[PDB]
Every structure is written in structure tokens, then in C-alpha cells.
Amino acid sequence: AALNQALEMKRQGKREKAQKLFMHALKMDPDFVDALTEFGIFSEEDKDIIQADYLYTRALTISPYHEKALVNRDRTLPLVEEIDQRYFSIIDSKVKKVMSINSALRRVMEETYYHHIYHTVAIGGNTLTLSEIRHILETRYAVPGKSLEEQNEVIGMHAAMKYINTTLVSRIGSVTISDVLEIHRRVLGYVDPVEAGRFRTTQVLVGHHIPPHPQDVEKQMQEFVQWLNSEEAMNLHPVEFAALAHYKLVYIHPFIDGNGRTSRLLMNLILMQAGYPPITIRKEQRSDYYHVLEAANEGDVRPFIRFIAKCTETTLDTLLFATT
Amino acid sequence: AALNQALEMKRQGKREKAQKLFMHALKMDPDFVDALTEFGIFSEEDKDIIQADYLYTRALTISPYHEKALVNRDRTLPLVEEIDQRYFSIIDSKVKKVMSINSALRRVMEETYYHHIYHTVAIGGNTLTLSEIRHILETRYAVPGKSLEEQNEVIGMHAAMKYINTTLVSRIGSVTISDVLEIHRRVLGYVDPVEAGRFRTTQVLVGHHIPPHPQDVEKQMQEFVQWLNSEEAMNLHPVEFAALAHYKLVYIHPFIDGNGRTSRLLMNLILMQAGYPPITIRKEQRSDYYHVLEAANEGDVRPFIRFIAKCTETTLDTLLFAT
Ligand SMILES: Nc1ncnc2c1ncn2[C@@H]1O[C@H](COP(=O)(O)OP(=O)(O)O)[C@@H](O)[C@H]1O
Ligand SMILES: Nc1ncnc2c1ncn2[C@@H]1O[C@H](COP(=O)(O)OP(=O)(O)O)[C@@H](O)[C@H]1O
Ligand SMILES: [Mg+2]
Ligand SMILES: [Mg+2]
């Protein structure tokens, strides 16, 4: 197709012109095996092995026998595994630095409470400012010219995090379906008391994702909590357990609304129980965040794990410098 | 005691001075049999047979053999039953007039929705104005410089009444414990999602009333719903059924908060199912409303029935401005 115009562009200069052409041929057919493999080869020239591996991996799901994809993937597979493991060790060192501290840290922890609430509500459509959120939580008084629903999302958030810290963080034992229901009960409660802490009764659509049918949600969730308490899940790197737990919940989509808020909170319960700080996916990241989740639906869960690992690194930085 | 000073004050003028003295002797001993009976006699001179009869009935619970209380109660008892029955027939006629109507009525019906919400929340401490309540329900936008909890009480009310009208009013069959839980779920939901539609786990105090222990709430409520569906309850005058349902639920006090709001709503479900309009206990009535509830706890549920019957008459009067 337009891939031939891309390859000719790569040969003798025109890198930017070639990259745009590759994107066009993939925009028409994102299942175009030869376009994926050629773009993967092109990505390695920019030192982007991670993307190249995804491109080669994506092609081998379409055509599991493509020779050019195969010979390249067989080289990128263990290499990327090593690149990702090294990043998780960088994260582990920054956690050692953060968990080796106090008054300097306390000031950061209070600043980030309103920051976590602002971004978890703003990522789902909420118009309230950090200043408006601070007014609501400190005063208990309403913000003028702003809907009551948007303000009850904030009261719900505060209550859910207060419940996790008080009841769930320091708690010894297995995580149950009821613990998940108690989080949502608070997240959605002040907004929708009828649906809060209750599963979806209807079939819904999340972007291009069609979650399990309401008849299957109970079996899917019982299987989910089993995985949370399974030995293999506890053997995973905490940053991997947290992203997988988040993804898996957001996929099941057990509730009408508040599935992301609950999932981003369950993720933070996981991290914290492993001695990691709570993390925030900023409202500006919605596009990549949605893209990586979409990529995980398509078969590759890795770009989401990396997105979560990057949010954890950026949270660990910020903490380090405000205490350095 | 000071009753002798009260009795002498009655002899030759000084009515106001004698009445205050009677109140003082009752403020010291509210179980003083001779003070109750003599105030009962005194009340009849003012044409208040209803209160005189309350006084004689109160004395006969303390001393079930007091001759002066007995001879008077035997006379006032069937007389009061006649006075109360006549009032219920006045109410019945005003319901016939109201349910024989339209544009004149429609204007009243809409104004009473916001009016019922304003008084049910204002009676429990809520500072929101009728105009602020109208803003919240019509716009879905918050009222500035007013707490979020006060505004979520209003959202809860609207949802609860919407659920009763849509699901409960025109529904055929028996009322369940779950229907009561569904009303409270909406009344309290937006304020306290944790406790909404869930029974008290702790023992509480309501004024001077100590409701059943949380261990007993389920048995007390199962007995309550049985009475709601019982033949004897359906045989009562609708204004009496509604007054008693409310008293019985508010006595049990099954929830941490929202007991009065659910009770005043359950009472309106009863009235409406009997073709009566919904009624409102105005915020200015909290004092009498509580006095009459305290009095029902003390053994006499009649002054609360009359309180409810008067609220129903005043509601029927506003609607009769249309004819
Ligand atoms: N393709 C997808 N598949 C699964 N989950 C997705 C997809 N795209 C977005 N999501 C998730 O769906 C959630 C949005 O649904 P929602 O229940 O309304 O969450 P919230 O209301 O708490 O903001 C977000 O957590 C997002 O992570
Ligand atoms: N002495 C009493 N005995 C029983 N119930 C009472 C007494 N005094 C008041 N009540 C009832 O208790 C209610 C207050 O309880 P509450 O849970 O706070 O209801 P709400 O918050 O909806 O107003 C009042 O509405 C009244 O109906
Ligand atoms: Mg949403
Ligand atoms: Mg109260």
C-alpha cells in the first residue's frame, strides 16, 4: 500500500516524511503485517526497541508465521524483558530512597491528597478546580455555580480513601469481593446511592470495549479476587501486580460508574501494602491512559504496565527533591 | 401540695393564676393523682373535655381506683370518642370536596411539593430556604455558602418521594420491610451512604425515649409490617392508621438518622393509598409534634392522632381555596 512510499522515503533522508507515511498505512490497516514489521525495523533506528517489540509482537498475533516479524521478535523478546526489569529496579532504588525518611515529607503527603482527588475526578470529566476541591473537603460547604453531583464525587473520594487507610491498608489477610463493594459504596454513594456498592444490572460500552454481561459479573469478580490472593500475583513485581489488578477490574467493569476511581484506588492499596507511595494518573494523561488500556484489550498488557511504572517513577520523583 | 393554693385561686376569679399553680404542682409531680383530677375538673370549665379526659386517663394509670378520676372518666370517655369521631367525619367531607375537582388545584399541588420538602427537612434542623430548595431541585446546582449535607438531604427527599410515587403508591399488595429500607436508602443515601437503608447497630437516645436495642430492631420491624398489612389496621380510620404507623416506626427508631423523614413519608403513602392528599407537619409545629410523641410514649396515643388529623384538615383547607 502506502508502505512502499514509506520505505522509499526511509532510503535517503526524509525520516519525518517516512514516519508520517508509516502512521497513515497503519491508520488505514492497523492489522497490516508488513507495515507493522517495517515500522518496527524503522523504530529500532530511533533506539526505540520497546515500540519495535510491540510492533513485531502485534504482527505475530495477526500472522503467527511471518518470517521478518519472527526473526526480529525472537531477538527483541528477551531484550525488552531485561529493559523492563531494569526499570523496575530503578523504581525499587527510588522507593529505598523515599522509604529512608519527618516534617519535610509530611508537607508533600498533604499536598498530594487534594492532588490525587483532583486528577482521579478530573480524568472522568469533573470540572472542579484543586482550590474548589480543597474548599469542599476543608469547609464541607458547597462551591457556587458548580453542580452538586461533581461535588459529591469529591466527598465520595475522600470517604473511600479514608476507609482504605483506616480499614484496608494495615489489615492482615485476603482481599474479598465485599472490600471492593465497600470502596465503591463510598466512591459512588453520595452521587448514586441506589447503584453504589452494587454490580451492573445492564450491559454497557467502555470506548470500544464491551465488558462481560451482567449475568457473568459475579463469576468474573470471584475469579478476580482469587487472582488477587493467588501465589503467582504475590510473586509479581508490586508495580506489575498493581497495573494488572487495575486493568483486570476496569476490563470486568462491574459497576455502572466509578470503575476507574475504584480501580485507581485498588491499585494504590496494592502499591501501599508493598511499601510504595500512592500514585496519581494525571488528567493530562487520559489520552495515553485510554490508548494503553485499548492496547491491552488488543492483546498486549505491557504498554499499560510501563505507563503505570512511569506514573510510579514521576510520583517517586517530586517526593525526592521536596525532601532533598 | 401547691394544688391547695391552686384550688383556692379557682374559688373567686383568678383563672390564669390558678392554671399556672396547677402547672407548677404537675411540674413537681406529674404523677400527682389529685393534681391531675383537679386540673381535669378545671379544664372542663374552659370547655376542654379532650384535655380533661387526658388528665383523668393519666391519673387512672397511676391510681386505677381513684373515685373522683373514675366518675369523671366514665362520663368523658364516650363523649371524647364522639368528639373525635365527628372530627374524622369533618375530614371525610373535606376529602369528598377535594376529590371532586383542573388548573386551580394544579397550582397548589406543585407549590406543596417544595413545601413538603422544605418542612420535612427544616423540622430536623435544615437551614435551606424554599427558594434554595427550588434552586437545588430545578437546577441540580449547589447553593452558595450552604453546607453540602443540607443540600443532599433535599436530593434524598426528592428521590424518596419520586420512588414512592413511581413504585409504591399505585402498587397492589402487602408493604414489606424492604420497601421501608428502599425509602430510607434514598432519604439518607446522598448524606450517609454507609448507613442508608441499613438498621441501627448502636443503642441511641431520642430526647427522653430509649428505642429498642439494635438486637431487637429486626423482630420489632417484622411485627410492625405485620400490623401494616393486618385486617385491624385496614379497619382503622385512614387518619388513625397513618398516625399510628408513624408513631410505631418512630418509636422503634430503626435507623441512626432519617427516622422522622421516613415516618412522615410512610404516613403519606398510607393517606394517599386511601385517597387522601399527602400532608405536611410544618417546622413551627416541632414543639407540639414532640410533645404529642412524648405523650404517646407516656401511654396516650390520642393527642398525636388529633395532631395528625389537624395537619390533615389544614392541608385539606389549603386545597379547598380552589372551590
Ligand atoms: N478500552 C477500555 N477497556 C477497559 N477499560 C477501559 C477502556 N478505556 C477506558 N477504560 C477505563 O474505564 C474507566 C472509565 O469508566 P468509569 O466506570 O466511568 O470510571 P470513573 O467513573 O470512575 O471515572 C476508566 O478507569 C478507564 O481506565
Ligand atoms: N419522644 C420521642 N419519641 C419517639 N420519637 C420521637 C420523639 N421525639 C421525636 N421523635 C421523632 O424522632 C424524629 C427525629 O429522629 P431522626 O432520625 O433524627 O429523624 P430525621 O433526621 O429525619 O428528622 C422526629 O422527627 C420525631 O418524629
Ligand atoms: Mg464516570
Ligand atoms: Mg436527625
Author numbering:
A (entry chain B): 108 to 208, 212 to 434
B (entry chain A): 108 to 208, 212 to 433
Q: Anything the authors wrote about it?
A:
In addition to apo structures of HYPE variants, we have also obtained structures with the ATP cofactor bound to an E234G variant and with ADP bound to either the HYPE E234G variant or to wild-type protein. The adenosine moiety of the ATP and ADP locks into a hydrophobic pocket formed between α3, αpost A and the flap loop; the side chain residues forming this pocket are Val360 (α3), Leu403 (αpost A), and Val316 (flap). The GNG anion hole (residues 368–370) accommodates the α-phosphate of the nucleotide, mainly through direct hydrogen bonds to the polypeptide backbone. A Mg2+ ion is visible in the E234G variant of HYPE; it bridges the α- and β-phosphates and is coordinated by the conserved Asp367 side chain. The position of clearly visible α- and β-phosphates in all three structures is the same, with the α-phosphate present in an orientation compatible with the AMPylation reaction. Measurements of binding of a range of ligands to the E234G variant (172–434) using thermal shift analysis excluded phosphocholine as a possible cofactor (utilized by some FIC-domain proteins such as AnkX) (no shift in Tm, data not shown) and showed similar binding of ATP and guanosine-5'-triphosphate, and a less strong binding of cytidine triphosphate and uridine triphosphate. Interestingly, binding of ADP was stronger than that of ATP. A possible reason could be that ATP adopts a less favorable conformation within the binding pocket compared to free ATP, a constraint that would not apply to ADP. The measurement of the dissociation constant (KD) of ADP binding to the E234G variant determined by isothermal titration calorimetry (ITC) was 160 nM.
